[PDB]
Design a protein around this ligand. Structure first.
Ligand code: CDL
Ligand code: CDL
Ligand code: HEA
Ligand code: HEA
Ligand code: PEK
Ligand code: PGV
Ligand code: PGV
Ligand code: DMU
Ligand code: DMU
Ligand code: DMU
Ligand code: DMU
Ligand code: CHD
Ligand code: CUA
Ligand code: CA
Ligand code: ZN
Lengths: 258, 91, 72, 227, 513, 75, 56, 40, 44
């Protein structure tokens, strides 16, 4: 070959991933309707195995085999931006649902927002703390990025550890707020919009934290150079996305919706 | 405050080949667009190849949307069948 | 620079988190639960939940989450 | 109702349906002309051995291709939006009737004065009386006064339905938790038929609408007799 | 070796071939569903059952034709085969992720066939509106299996969109600007942008439907303060872009076919064609509520959606006129592919024009949820999208296979299909204007003549579909190997031979500035 | 009184809030009159309008919920 | 910790014809076999579950 | 396009067999189901 | 991997009669499926 692009070795992970999607969806069907978690637990297991081996192989191809030329790296940058755009439009659907319900509250709610019988969380208590936590994590991840570009291994690891700690703190605070909330997902469209929008956000925080932990262990193993570290850049972009979604949730659901 | 490898230390495989060739001003992996000559029979466009034929696309005039494609073979210079521009294979 | 972003991490960002942690700390402690009223737009049950007895939400808190029939 | 081998709209029973027929005539002339011109030009491009295969300049001709369609669209939109705003105009109804969609029948409520309500079900094929229409007759028709502005309000007590009467130009979706309004005015006495116009399950095909348009005095006596 | 090649592929051509095989199989399923519809409608009275089994068939017909036939053939099949060859790229940007876009489709299809086998099926319409699609009126697993089918198809297409956009932006020769890529490549890039933005909104909406059905949410349930109309907005915000996704790759194939069989080096008005496709893509996001003119929205909202919808005729007309101007002065070759393309230009124009009729909210009151809508969309889908697929299939079959079709059989095929689709759908205009509703298993007696003729049409189309299978068999059975192909100087995908080697452009093209 | 007149507050196809507002207004009026020992006859207009516009099942359900203590509107 | 990347670069560039998903050695084969066995076996179980759910 | 003569020519008789088998593969199973609708 | 006509496909075209059987089964199964699903729904 005399181009710079990556011809990938034939791989089983696309098929295992597709079958994991069949097992998770047929598994959710079996859980919702036939009172059984068996297929779902097989699908989640095969999905985790597939993700692990697929991304392991991308690290082998890049760090170990040198297939990530600038042209390949530029493709991955576009791929991650486009993926983030698709996730923004997914959240847009949930914001649309929220504004539709809250701007024109129906007679069943008492014709008011919040609905009769809903006692919202105080946005100045744990939700404000959660806001400070994710904003702080956007600062610490930026410190980590600069440390890596400047060749500073110890400060990169410290800044990334702080970022992950804050992601975990957010997740534990949200778990506690879920438990303490006097309203539930079954509390009409208020509970529906609140828990589905914040719940998909929480999942994305867990995904983003996991991505940052992968970057932490790769950094511990010296995979990143001061100039070549796309996995870290992608995790940082994803992490900023999770921050920005939170700020929109905070202003929309917790503050303006209270 | 150090401990992060450099590309110079740790880049490998094709990434390293591209890095080292670029330091030398060389483009073995076709990252850059070649600059045209006058394209006469005396001053043909020189087309590198690792084999005895390569596809050429000729953008005959600036901003043409239509690219003209043809195999250029080792031997005497060939002409773009649209604009007559000369190309010569350098295997 | 890294130096500037570390300065912001320790000089602004983490102090903000500490102040908001103080603020949440101070306003914590259980507020009284409201009288139960069996409003038809709340405690929705169109299908049993796929866990427990079918009538408890996933992070049911007995202190503040009544069932359709009221507090446990 | 529709008749065998029908090509176009049911004859108009309301002034707005009349307006829709003339607007459809205007639009269809344009559709015919554009379809015909494209077919003709295709046939013209394909019927000569003469050739011209060198690069052709596009900008002059693209002016015609954009401006002439833009003018045609304006010539459709102007009468289109005149009719849209005519149907939306304030009218002052004499009567309000509600219809509620159900699986699979319509109920009607005339509650301006008395609590009058009833259910309207399709006549089964095996029970049709000689001369009656398969899948179109109901047991209890929606009796209404002719030559009077009527407010119809439409909702559902289950899934989506849609309340339609083509000869009056009516189709209003029946949505649970929502009260949709339309106006009905018949120029003529008679029987005017429609059918459920949103997929609603097993008997979607089998929950029709029959309006019975009569003079006010007859409507008043029917109303009293239905209490 | 067989498993490594066909289950573990990282090759754009083999993955394209898998998509074409999948889409062909899906087309047979969709055709059988269409024939069950027309068998019921071809005589008054009930043949199969009440509206439930009938609308399970209608629902499945639509999901199969759209998600399993058209999108996999146009995007997965023609896109994977042709896009890298037309830009001189050695494969797709993400050649392993490409394989997962393919392998998500068999499971998606399995979930749809499971939906129809369990309980009483999903008799909802392909729009899956609540509350009919909810857990009271459609209790049990069928609708949840349909939702999960759509989730897997959506992920397939979202990852495919990321792959196509990245490939087309990042993997051209360095001298080649976006304004030197072929129109088919533009048509796939624009389709991929529509998929990337539209499918996540569908995903959000059907996820809300899933939680209403299983987790006691009330997004769409008025008892909890929800609104069935919210579901319609979310669905159609996806659904209008979806129809542009179905046609845009067809427009790209028609531009290549008309150019090729006109003996031209280039389509007329390249930049106008690019402008037209980007304008259609953009306008396709701001018009969705033309699917909702009877739900009770405000008059000013109806006026806006009427006007914005009509605007799409302007860029679309530029494309139609530019195709005619491409024919103008051509050395016309009356190939089977050219016949498909000419059929497309005319029949797509007719369907586009009945769309303009429907864009008028005042007239749409009377035409909504009638066969007039069914006539409109089958002119653009069964005579537009399908004619572009058949033209591209007969045009590029020799590239993909290395063998030729029998051109006389292919012309016979075209003639039969042309008669059948027109006999099927033309009379549905009359049924619509006279008020026959959609999604009816049975109709008042007055509508018998046109339903009878329409059903006779559908049987002619079945004869065409059966003949197409025979024609593909006869090509592989006879093994006429390709020797020479004209116009390779302006059709790069042909320049590596028929079929091209597994690896093409290992040495990239030379293009200078 | 023939039927509910055009109300500029509710000029569009969706008349849900027109029914709701008149039901609330009648019951608020009835409560204000019964409280002072005044005359519910003053509330008649709101009663005629909500009876004209409101589905029987909506009124019936709202009445049931007022009696249960589960009506979510302020009266 | 120490930088052992060069040792992994040598292992993963060995000219042994192994695809990247098996090039780590015997552990890769085991994890592949576990993954594919759970996938194919789970898929057969999902088809049995359809068979069951297809009848009252 | 130009092409070689067929490597394995398919005679009119062979085409009649292929066309017949293809049509029967579509028609017989559907035919059996639709014939037996009354029984279902 | 094998290259060239008849070799870049997951099915054999070595024997036109075996191929006719495979194509018959392939396209015939897709066309038959909806009829058998309708039969299945009617027999509940
Ligand atoms: C969940 C699923 C999500 C997917 C995550 C993607 C990960 C991709 C990384 C990858 O595959 O690389 C492994 C891979 C292991 O090495 P290798 O290529 O496999 O072997 C040769 C290498 O070149 C080796 O070179 P090296 O420089 O990479 O060194 C690696 C390793 C070399 O060791 C070896 O791998 C070979 C030695 C043989 C022993 C084999 C044991 C490993 C088996 C893994 C099983 C995982 C299954 C996952 C599914 C579980 C389902 C029940 O050396 C070690 O001493 C480390 C031991 C192995 C580390 C990985 C252990 C994973 C635990 C599971 C986590 C998932 C949960 O190492 C890399 O190439 C990079 C690894 C560094 C990053 C790992 C980070 C894991 C972080 C887990 C996140 C948990 C989130 C917690 C939630 C909290 C939220 C609030
Ligand atoms: C191969 C394909 C095989 C054939 C497929 C099936 C053929 C159907 C046969 C229809 C013949 C009907 C009939 O009984 O004719 C007697 C019928 C007796 O005349 P009439 O009762 O005085 O009709 C006047 C209507 O009142 C006139 O007013 P109206 O309001 O009653 O009529 C409106 C109506 C009436 O429209 C028509 O009459 C349709 C004419 C067919 C176009 C050719 O329907 C439409 O709007 C049709 C929508 C069509 C969409 C646009 C089509 C693009 C045209 C393509 C141009 C190519 C030109 C070559 O004669 C016709 O008009 C022939 C049609
Ligand atoms: C791509 C989309 C598409 C296509 C092609 C078709 C094709 C056909 N459709 Fe339709 N149909 C829809 C999408 C489509 N349909 C949708 C979205 C609905 C609405 C559903 C709802 O209301 O919810 C619908 C509804 C619908 C109805 C209305 C049902 C009702 O309201 O009760 C009818 C009625 O006759 C009908 C009939 C047909 C017929 C006879 C064909 C025939 O023309 C089909 C003939 C066969 C083909 C055209 C070939 C197919 C195969 C290929 C092209 C593969 C080729 C192989 C290779 C390239 C190797 N369909
Ligand atoms: C490939 C698929 C496809 C395409 C491309 C289109 C294209 C268009 N569609 Fe259609 N449509 C469908 C598939 C498609 N549609 C489907 C499936 C449904 C039903 C969904 C369901 O309910 O299940 C539907 C429904 C639908 C409705 C809803 C009707 C209702 O349910 O009551 C409307 C409303 O405006 C609409 C309009 C249009 C318009 C204006 C275009 C325009 O893009 C057409 C533009 C083209 C032209 C106008 C022709 C060429 C132009 C010229 C030659 C220039 C000169 C022309 C003029 C000056 C007018 N269509
Ligand atoms: C701390 C934040 C992290 C969240 C993790 C917690 C739970 C499991 C996973 C959640 C994933 C995210 C969203 C899914 C939807 C619902 C969960 C919302 C978040 C949540 O956890 O909500 C809880 C309800 O959970 C429930 O019903 C539980 C429901 C569990 C089953 C989930 C069903 C999944 C639905 C399928 C998803 C489809 C994805 C589509 C992909 C796109 C393809 C195109 C709230 O508890 P509660 O007791 O009602 O009220 C609190 C009272 N004290
Ligand atoms: C309880 C929760 C369960 C749900 C499952 C999901 C959970 C966790 C997933 C966490 C994501 C982990 C991703 C790890 C990727 C590791 C591979 C990697 O980072 O690979 C990098 C390339 O990036 C790349 O592929 C970029 C790869 C990016 C992909 C990540 C996208 C996020 C995944 C979202 C998954 C589902 C979200 C949708 C939910 C609705 C390798 O290039 P460099 O880093 O430049 O190294 C090379 C240098 O060493 C050379 O000197
Ligand atoms: C109800 C339950 C339904 C859920 C069904 C779930 C569906 C499927 C199961 C998913 C299994 C995922 C397994 C991991 C896939 C990783 C893909 C990846 O990371 O792909 C990368 C490309 O995409 C990129 O970067 C950027 C894009 C990365 C996207 C990664 C994963 C996406 C998974 C879900 C996304 C849906 C989005 C939600 C919003 C609508 C790498 O491309 P490759 O071609 O591999 O390599 C190219 C080589 O040069 C690398 O060295
Ligand atoms: C590695 C491959 C080989 C391993 C194969 C996996 C074997 C697992 C089979 C066990 O099946 C389980 O049975 C439980 C009870 O028998 C179910 O709990 C169900 O019943 C419980 C109580 O009976 C409820 O509390 C739960 O909500 C409910 O899901 C559970 O769903 C289901 O998974
Ligand atoms: C609607 C379909 C009708 C198609 C009409 C297309 C019109 C195209 C004309 C443009 O071509 C021109 O022809 C001239 C010679 O005649 C040339 O001198 C000129 O350089 C060239 O630009
Ligand atoms: C590598 C291959 C992949 C491994 C495939 C493994 C398949 C075998 C799983 C065993 O099957 C289970 O049988 C249980 C019967 O005991 C079911 O119990 C469930 O159904 C019971 C019915 O009695 C109820 O008591 C409960 O809901 C629950 O225990 C459960 O659903 C089901 O999974
Ligand atoms: C919409 C797609 C389908 C369109 C129509 C297809 C045309 C039908 C083709 C013939 O199908 C066959 O017809 C036979 C009858 O002609 C059936 O035999 C049935 O009738 C025979 C004669 O009475 C008996 O001997 C058999 O046992 C009995 O199955 C036979 O099963 C069936 O395969
Ligand atoms: C001793 C070790 C050296 C790493 C190395 O250079 O190989 C150091 C450098 C940075 C350290 C990490 C960072 O200081 C951040 C964390 C600090 C906590 O107090 C312990 C865990 C924690 C995650 C540290 C673990 C470990 O001591 C690390 C990883
Ligand atoms: Cu009621 Cu359709
Ligand atoms: Ca029938
Ligand atoms: Zn040239």
């Amino acid at each position: 070959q005399t181009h710079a692009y990556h011809m990938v070795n034939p791989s089983p992970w696309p098929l295992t991933g597709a079958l994991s999607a069949l097992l998770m969806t047929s598994g959710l069907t079996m859980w919702f309707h036939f009172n059984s978690m068996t297929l779902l637990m097989i699908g989640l297991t095969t999905n985790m195995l597939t993700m692990y081996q697929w991304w392991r192989d991308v690290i082998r191809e890049s760090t170990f085999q040198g297939h990530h030329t600038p042209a390949v790296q530029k493709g991955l940058r576009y791929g991650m931006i486009l993926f983030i755009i698709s996730e923004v439009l997914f959240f847009t659907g949930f914001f649309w649902a929220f504004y539709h319900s809250s701007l024109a509250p129906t007679p069943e709610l008492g014709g008011c927002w919040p609905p009769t019988g809903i006692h919202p969380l105080n946005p100045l208590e744990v939700p404000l703390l959660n806001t400070s936590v994710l904003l702080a994590s956007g600062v610490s991840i930026t410190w980590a990025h600069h440390s890596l570009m400047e060749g500073d291994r110890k400060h990169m690891l410290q800044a990334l550890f702080i970022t992950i700690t804050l992601g975990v703190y957010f997740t534990l605070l949200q778990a506690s707020e879920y438990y303490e909330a006097p309203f539930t997902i079954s509390d009409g469209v208020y509970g529906s919009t609140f828990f589905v929008a914040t719940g998909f956000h929480g999942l994305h925080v867990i995904i983003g934290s996991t991505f940052l932990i992968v970057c932490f262990f790769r950094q511990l193993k010296f995979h990143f150079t001061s100039n070549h570290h796309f996995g870290f850049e992608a995790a940082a972009w994803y992490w900023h996305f999770v921050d920005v979604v939170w700020l929109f949730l905070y202003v929309s659901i917790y503050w303006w919706g209270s | 405050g150090g401990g992060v490898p450099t590309d110079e230390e740790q880049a490998t495989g094709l990434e390293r080949e591209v890095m080292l060739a670029a330091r030398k001003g060389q483009d073995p992996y076709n990252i850059l667009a070649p600059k045209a000559t006058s394209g006469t029979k005396e001053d043909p466009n020189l087309v590198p190849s690792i084999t005895n034929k390569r596809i050429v696309g000729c953008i005959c005039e600036e901003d043409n949307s239509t690219v003209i494609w043809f195999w250029l073979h080792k031997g005497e210079a060939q002409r773009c069948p649209s604009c007559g521009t000369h190309y010569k294979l350098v295997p | 620079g890294a130096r500037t972003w570390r300065f912001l991490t320790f000089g602004l960002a983490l102090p903000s988190v500490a102040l908001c942690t103080l603020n949440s700390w101070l306003h914590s402690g259980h507020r009284e639960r409201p009288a139960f009223i069996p409003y038809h737009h709340l405690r929705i049950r169109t299908k049993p939940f796929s866990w427990g007895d079918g009538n408890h939400t996933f992070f049911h808190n007995p202190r503040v989450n009544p069932l359709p029939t009221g507090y446990e | 109702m529709a008749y065998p081998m029908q090509l176009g709209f049911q004859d108009a029973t309301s002034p707005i349906m009349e307006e829709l027929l003339h607007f459809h005539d205007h639009t269809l002339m344009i559709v015919f002309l554009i379809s015909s011109l494209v077919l003709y030009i295709i046939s013209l491009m394909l019927t000569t051995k003469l050739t011209h295969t060198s690069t052709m300049d596009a900008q002059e001709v693209e002016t015609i291709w954009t401006i002439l369609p833009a003018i045609i669209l304006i010539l459709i939109a102007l009468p289109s939006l005149r009719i849209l705003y005519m149907m939306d105009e304030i009218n002052n109804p004499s009567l309000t009737v509600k219809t509620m969609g159900h699986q699979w029948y319509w109920s009607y409520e005339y509650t301006d004065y008395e609590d009058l309500s009833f259910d309207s079900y399709m006549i089964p094929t095996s029970e049709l009386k000689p001369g009656e229409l398969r899948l179109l007759e109901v047991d209890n028709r929606v009796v209404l006064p002719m030559e009077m502005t009527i407010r119809m309000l439409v909702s559902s007590e289950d899934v989506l339905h849609s309340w339609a009467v083509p000869s009056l130009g009516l189709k209003t979706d029946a949505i649970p938790g929502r009260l949709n309004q339309t106006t009905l005015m018949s120029s003529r006495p008679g029987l005017y038929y429609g059918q459920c116009s949103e997929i609603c399950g097993s008997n979607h095909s089998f929950m029709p609408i029959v309006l019975e348009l009569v003079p006010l005095k007859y409507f008043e006596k029917w109303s009293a007799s239905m209490l | 070796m067989f498993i490594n090649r066909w289950l573990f592929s990282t090759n754009h051509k083999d993955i394209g071939t898998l998509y074409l095989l999948f889409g062909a199989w899906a087309g047979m399923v969709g055709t059988a569903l269409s024939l069950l519809i027309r068998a019921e409608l071809g005589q008054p009275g009930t043949l199969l059952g009440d509206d439930q089994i009938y609308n399970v068939v209608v629902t499945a017909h639509a999901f199969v034709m759209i998600f399993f036939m058209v999108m996999p053939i146009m995007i997965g099949g023609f896109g994977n085969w042709l896009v890298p060859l037309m830009i001189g790229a050695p494969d797709m940007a993400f050649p392993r992720m490409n394989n997962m876009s393919f392998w998500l489709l068999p499971p998606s299809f399995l979930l749809l066939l499971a939906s129809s086998m369990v309980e009483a099926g999903a008799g909802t319409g392909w729009t899956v509106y609540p509350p009919l699609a909810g857990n009271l009126a459609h209790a049990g697993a069928s609708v949840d299996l349909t939702i999960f089918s759509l989730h897997l198809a959506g992920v397939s297409s979202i990852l495919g969109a990321i792959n196509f956009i990245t490939t087309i932006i990042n993997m051209k020769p360095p001298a080649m600007s976006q304004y030197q890529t072929p129109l088919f490549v533009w048509s796939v890039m624009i389709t991929a942008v529509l998929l990337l933005l539209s499918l996540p909104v569908l995903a959000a909406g059907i996820t809300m439907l899933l939680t209403d059905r299983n987790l006691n949410t009330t997004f769409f349930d008025p008892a909890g303060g929800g609104d069935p109309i919210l579901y319609q907005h979310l669905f159609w915000f996806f659904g209008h872009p979806e129809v542009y996704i179905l046609i845009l790759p067809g427009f790209g194939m028609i531009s290549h076919i008309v150019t090729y069989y006109s003996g031209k080096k280039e389509p007329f008005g390249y930049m106008g064609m690019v402008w037209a496709m980007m304008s259609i893509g953009f306008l396709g996001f701001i018009v969705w509520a033309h699917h909702m003119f009877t739900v009770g929205m405000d008059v000013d909202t109806r006026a806006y959606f009427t006007s914005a919808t009509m605007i799409i005729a302007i860029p679309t007309g530029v494309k139609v006129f530019s195709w005619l101007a491409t024919l103008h002065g051509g050395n016309i070759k009356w190939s089977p592919a050219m016949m498909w393309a000419l059929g497309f230009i005319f029949l797509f124009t007719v369907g586009g024009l009945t769309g303009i009729v429907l864009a008028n909210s005042s007239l749409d009151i009377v035409l909504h949820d009638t066969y007039y809508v069914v006539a409109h969309f089958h002119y653009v889908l069964s005579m537009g999208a399908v004619f572009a697929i058949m033209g591209g299939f007969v045009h590029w079959f020799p590239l993909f296979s290395g063998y030729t079709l029998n051109d006389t059989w292919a012309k016979i095929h075209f003639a039969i299909m042309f008669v059948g689709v027109n006999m099927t759908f033309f009379p549905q205009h009359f049924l619509g204007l006279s008020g026959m509703p959609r999604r009816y298993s049975d109709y008042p007696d007055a509508y018998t003549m046109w339903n009878t003729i329409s059903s006779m049409g559908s049987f002619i189309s079945l004869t065409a579909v059966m003949l197409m299978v025979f024609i593909i068999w006869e090509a592989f059975a006879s093994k006429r190997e390709v020797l020479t192909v004209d116009l390779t100087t302006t059709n790069l995908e042909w320049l590596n031979g028929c079929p091209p080697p597994y690896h093409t452009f290992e040495e990239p093209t030379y293009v200078n500035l | 009184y023939q039927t509910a007149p055009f109300d500029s507050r509710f000029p569009n196809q969706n008349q849900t809030r027109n029914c709701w507002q008149n039901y609330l207004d009648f019951h608020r009026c009835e409560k204000a009159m019964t409280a002072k020992g005044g005359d519910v006859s003053v509330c008649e207009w709101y009663r005629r309008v909500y009876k004209s516009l409101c589905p029987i099942s909506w009124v019936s359900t709202w009445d049931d919920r007022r009696a249960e203590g589960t009506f979510p509107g302020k009266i | 910790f120490e930088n052992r990347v060069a040792e992994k670069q040598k292992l993963f560039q060995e000219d042994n014809g192994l695809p990247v998903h098996l090039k780590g050695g015997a552990t890769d084969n085991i994890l592949y076999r576990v993954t594919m066995t759970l996938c194919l076996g789970g898929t057969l179980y999902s088809l049995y579950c359809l068979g069951w759910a297809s009848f009252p | 396009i130009t092409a070689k003569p067929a490597k394995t020519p398919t005679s009119p008789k062979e085409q009649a067999i292929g066309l017949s088998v293809t049509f029967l593969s579509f028609l017989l199973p559907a035919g059996w189901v639709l014939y037996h609708l009354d029984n279902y | 991997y094998e290259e060239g006509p008849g070799k870049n496909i997951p099915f054999s075209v070595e024997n036109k009669w075996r191929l006719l059987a495979m194509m018959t089964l392939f396209f015939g199964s897709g066309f038959a499926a909806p009829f058998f699903i309708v039969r299945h729904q009617l027999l509940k």
